Amino acid sequence: GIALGMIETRGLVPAIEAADAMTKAAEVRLVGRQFVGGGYVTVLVRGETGAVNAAVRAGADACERVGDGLVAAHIIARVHSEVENILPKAPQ
Amino acid sequence: VTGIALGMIETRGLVPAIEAADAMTKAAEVRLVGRQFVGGGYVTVLVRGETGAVNAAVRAGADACERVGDGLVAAHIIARVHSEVENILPKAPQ
Amino acid sequence: GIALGMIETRGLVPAIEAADAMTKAAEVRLVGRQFVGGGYVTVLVRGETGAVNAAVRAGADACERVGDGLVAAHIIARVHSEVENILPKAPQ
Amino acid sequence: VTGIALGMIETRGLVPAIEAADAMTKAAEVRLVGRQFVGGGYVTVLVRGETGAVNAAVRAGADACERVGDGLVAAHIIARVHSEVENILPKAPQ
Amino acid sequence: GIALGMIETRGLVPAIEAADAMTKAAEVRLVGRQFVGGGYVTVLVRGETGAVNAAVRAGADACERVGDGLVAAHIIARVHSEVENILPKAPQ
Amino acid sequence: GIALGMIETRGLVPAIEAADAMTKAAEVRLVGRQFVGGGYVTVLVRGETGAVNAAVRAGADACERVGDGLVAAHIIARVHSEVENILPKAPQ
Amino acid sequence: VTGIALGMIETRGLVPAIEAADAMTKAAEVRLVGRQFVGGGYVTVLVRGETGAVNAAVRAGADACERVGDGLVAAHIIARVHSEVENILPKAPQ
Amino acid sequence: GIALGMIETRGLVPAIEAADAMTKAAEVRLVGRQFVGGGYVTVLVRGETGAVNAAVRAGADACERVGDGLVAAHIIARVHSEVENILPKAPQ
Amino acid sequence: GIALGMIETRGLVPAIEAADAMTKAAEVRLVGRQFVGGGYVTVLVRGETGAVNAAVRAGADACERVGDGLVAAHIIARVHSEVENILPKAPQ
Amino acid sequence: GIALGMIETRGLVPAIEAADAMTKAAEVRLVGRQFVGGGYVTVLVRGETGAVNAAVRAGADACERVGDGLVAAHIIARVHSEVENILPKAPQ
Amino acid sequence: MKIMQVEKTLVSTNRIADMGHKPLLVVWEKPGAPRQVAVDAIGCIPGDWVLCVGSSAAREAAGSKSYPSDLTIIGIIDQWN
Amino acid sequence: MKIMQVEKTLVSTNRIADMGHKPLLVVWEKPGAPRQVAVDAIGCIPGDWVLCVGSSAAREAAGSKSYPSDLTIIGIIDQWN
Amino acid sequence: MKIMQVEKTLVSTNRIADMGHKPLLVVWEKPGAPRQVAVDAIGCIPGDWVLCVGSSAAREAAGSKSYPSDLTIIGIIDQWN
């Protein structure tokens, strides 16, 4: 699957909780955790479209009430090839 | 993809920036040349191309990312970039 | 133990106090202190589920009234294998 | 200077932190072991020493820096530091 | 001289203006410019006590109205030897 | 597909109508019909995530107005291996 | 998975019970040992494990199933089960 | 002992808690757990009269606030020989 | 994929915009553009269920404000074999 | 220890009570009793910082309600070498 | 608080009514040590290692400020030998 | 009050909710002496020599007049052997 | 109450703020006996024979109904050996 799931949170604890929720909810691969700056943290998953939809829904629900909460939850079904250059491949 | 025009979109957070980059690259024939973490939550994505393509791409990206996450901060186009500014413009996204 | 506990604070002093309280409360290992950005600091511990529960509760209680205070206190009893790639293994 | 107690002061900005460090080191027999830029403007200074010395130093530093610049955020003392926390405590200021 | 002058500003432009003002006002050495984080910038000078007093006064006056303005202006006549380890020696 | 769809109804007629609706709406396998007790009846389907989503939506819409109506409609994208032991494999 | 603690969740209907079982098994290292049709619509799911794991699992399961279908009835934990009660506790889900 | 104690609850969780509390409270033998129907569950113990009295009191106290609660808690010190034909001898 | 996506618009410009939006949003095949009569225009896509869901959502959002706007947006997860005879195979 | 504690009172009776309380409270050495003039009397102790802190607190508490009462109770943990020239070394 | 092992149950039929319905357990620090009786506020089996509190805290731990108890079990130790 | 040395931590997951979030430590007067459990109101490491108070004072020292404790650590001794 | 001899002073810098300013003394029934720590409400020197009260009376003897003490010195014995 090549769909992209994205959850942004205020702080790292809601981000980790969201990542755990998505990876438990569906068969998606956690490909990155980014410290954006100013407290924003983003977690990204890849997988089939339906799996990513389920994972993002579960992650948003799980992290909405943890810590300072959730900022954004977005799904891109098909990513343009140019955008692949700014997406991490592995969660270093 | 040729052209030396520059299109920039600034957002609050990474998710709207990624949505804007996807929208720009889908809307027009532009190259994504960089994503920059400015600090304090600002994220900027930059594209290059012909003037008309960059104009269309920036319009589409602003429209797409204005409602995602914490939203959109800036959307700007420069038709011709001075050679001095090319030293501070990234060449590849990485 | 493979359970995970984390505490997020505003500033470094409450984070240090929270980490000290957790490690004194139970048999848990401090695996990371992350400067999230914008003032957020997160400390993470690993151990058996009951030990982590006790440690996180004690740490939240201890750091609640220190400095700018506590942001989040969370326990994940069973961590998905994907999240281990973004969890640190030792502090720096 | 011996002792394993820890004293910490958190301020908004570097000037109050430097004033607090000077006040602590002048007030008591403590070692300045670190100044950390937390992010978002927070700065933390850490001292080590005996429990009474660290107590006096932290009191003096908080009093001195509370009125400098953007002020004081936190002032805390830990008499005995768990060995796990020593891994995240700096050993030399640098 | 071993006195210490310190000016903290919101942003880099007032900090540079303050540094120029102090170094023009008195015979002081600019020993550091620190990006504190969150927008704070600090500039430090060393010199004789009276020179540092004059320099800090001039720098505060010059930078108080530039950009987002001045945060703090402080003088320490005699610095404890322990504090020297956290002060830069040269403005890298 | 290993996603799980579930519809619970008050009575057997809405349950049968829901099962017919899901199996017609998407390519899902009807794996069980359970008489819970007290009038509750549950019908379970398995399949790909998107197929199960469509099937459950259609079944809920079809059975919501039949007889005593619908009690619950739920989708689990990825079922934990332990839960498989309480799910029927074939609709006996 | 070892441990002799017992965690039980009672719901109205089978769908919330299945959701609770999934949530428990995903949340903690527990074994699902039974699903029982009590009568009158009550359904009970039982897990075994260590005390902390069972505590976490029961909390997660109650939170997950409280809003599904006709809802949640009971959520309880017994750290140590008397040997007499093991005769009425199921050993395998089946 | 030939005394009989029984506790009736709404649901199985309070019944299990009541049986556990009784057997922990006194030296009594759990001889049955009956699904009465309509949600009623009854647990029965046998033993010496004082032991059964203590066990039933403790079990009622423990199960009063669990789930849908307690229905009945009764002690029969001397059971007529006819009732033994409807009393179970061992649980299933 | 054999799911069917359908968008109906008032006029041809919103229909073309919707077709572009769906084909960019997901991996779907544009199989027909029909001039219904009276100004109605319908565009049809085929693909996997999740891809078609994403494509139809994107197309409806894109064409809702163009020209005289959107009339209908519908998804059929599994098409009955009889209905295949009235659906175009290629966009002539 | 080289820390310094001092208590100032109005009159000699509260000063004697304060000195007695300090020396009984901790391991400190009474190094001076000074008749300041105008009724002021000051007693000074030396020792380790914690011992001096405890002694001064106890002495202030003890002498607060004796005679004309307490004027000052102060602790100097680190005494500058210059002040040692005005500090007495032994009482008279 | 003391760490003690539960030995067996104890029944006193004619105990004062202030004791309510709470059960009683025989506890000791180790087999062969002097025996004590505690109010079981948790629910424990023989052989369990438990935490017991005395003094006035046992009264509130057993249910009320006026409960007649000077030893109450307040928890089961997760791992002990 | 008694002078005791902290040995190790203690965890009771199913302890009564009245215990709050406070941690528990195993203490003894010396290695090999009978073990006791205290509420840690200070934050102590193993090997620390601590001051422990019992009776009704331990309840208030642990946080409230109704806290279920009969032994609370109230300080770390600066120098002891 | 118990008759005890004062041995030495005790300092705990990080003790809880509820302890106020009161000093602490190490006491024992005789040299070599187990050591205890008492709040000095009188002011005593090493070697003094003192009267020590425990339980809840020590709290009020130390200054207030909520003072954290279970052993307080309340007097010096005029003549004792």
Numbering used by the authors:
A (entry chain C), C (entry chain E), E (entry chain C), F (entry chain C), H (entry chain E), I (entry chain C), ...: 6 to 97
B (entry chain D), D (entry chain D), G (entry chain D): 4 to 97
K (entry chain 4), L (entry chain 4), M (entry chain 4): 1 to 81
Reproduce, without paraphrasing, sentences from the article in which this PDB structure was first reported.
HCO3− is accumulated intracellularly by membrane-bound transporters and CO2-uptake complexes and diffuses through the selectively permeable carboxysome shell into the interior; it is then rapidly converted to shell-impermeable CO2 by the encapsulated zinc metalloenzyme, CA. In comparison, canonical α-carboxysomes utilize β-type CAs, namely CsoSCA. In this study, we determined the homohexameric structure of CsoSCA from H. neapolitanus and investigated how it is recruited into α-carboxysome shells composed of CsoS1A and CsoS4A shell proteins, as well as CsoSCA encapsulation in the context of Rubisco.
We generated constructs that express either the NTD or CTD of CsoSCA, as well as a CTD deletion of CsoSCA; all three constructs contain a His6 tag fused at the C-terminus of CsoSCA for immunoblot detection. To investigate the molecular basis for these interactions, we evaluated the CsoSCA–shell association by performing single-particle cryo-EM on purified minishell/CsoSCAΔC and minishell/CsoSCA-C. Initial analysis of micrographs from a preliminary dataset revealed the presence of T = 3 and T = 4 shells in both samples, which is consistent with the shell population observed from expression of empty minishells. Notably, we observed a marked increase in the internal density in T = 4 shells compared to T = 3 at lowered contour levels. Therefore, we specifically purified T = 4 minishells by collecting elution fractions from ion exchange chromatography and screening for fractions enriched with larger minishells by negative-staining TEM. Despite these efforts, we were unable to resolve ordered internal densities in our cryo-EM maps. In contrast to the previously reported CsoS2-containing minishells, we found no evidence of structured peptide interactions between CsoSCA and the internal shell surface. This observation suggests that CsoSCA interacts with the α-carboxysome shell in a nonspecific and dynamic manner. Closer inspection showed that the disordered internal density in both maps contacts the CsoS1A hexamer but not the CsoS4A pentamer. This supports our earlier findings and suggests that CsoSCA is likely localized to the α-carboxysome shell facet rather than the shell vertices. In addition, the internal density in both maps appear to contact CsoS1A hexamers in proximity to their central pore regions, although this remains to be further validated in future studies.
